[PDB]
Design a protein around this nucleic acid. Structure first.
Ligand SMILES: [Zn+2]
Ligand SMILES: [Zn+2]
Ligand SMILES: [Zn+2]
Length: 88
DNA sequence: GAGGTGTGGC
DNA sequence: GCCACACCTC
């Protein structure tokens, strides 16, 4: 009646709290990657949606994160964070 | 730079 | 489910 979301694969008894995390984990067993990049010529596929959204910034040149000292811009927040270490 | 992924807010 | 942070790995 009330229980955690479990992976019913024989060799996997792992569990998750969010249903979305289990659905993503199942794709590691089947190898499915339903999130396709429609950019003509790319062909990349991903198991989750967020790496595709992130990947897409490569094509669009979207770089919201900018260093306010040297003016260099990045497409990801983790890239800016690492860059800031250069200004310590 | 970039993908892969654990985790969480909405 | 979507999106994003943060960390890992190459
Ligand atoms: Zn599993
Ligand atoms: Zn692409
Ligand atoms: Zn800078």
């Amino acid at each position: 009646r009330t229980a955690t979301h479990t992976c019913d694969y024989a060799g996997c008894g792992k569990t998750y709290t969010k249903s979305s995390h289990l659905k993503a984990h199942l794709r590691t067993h089947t190898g499915e990657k339903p999130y396709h990049c429609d950019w003509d010529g790319c062909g990349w596929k991903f198991a989750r949606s967020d790496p595709l959204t992130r990947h897409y910034r490569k094509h669009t040149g979207h770089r919201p994160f900018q260093c306010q000292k040297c003016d260099r811009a990045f497409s990801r927040s983790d890239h800016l964070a690492l860059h800031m270490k250069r200004h310590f």
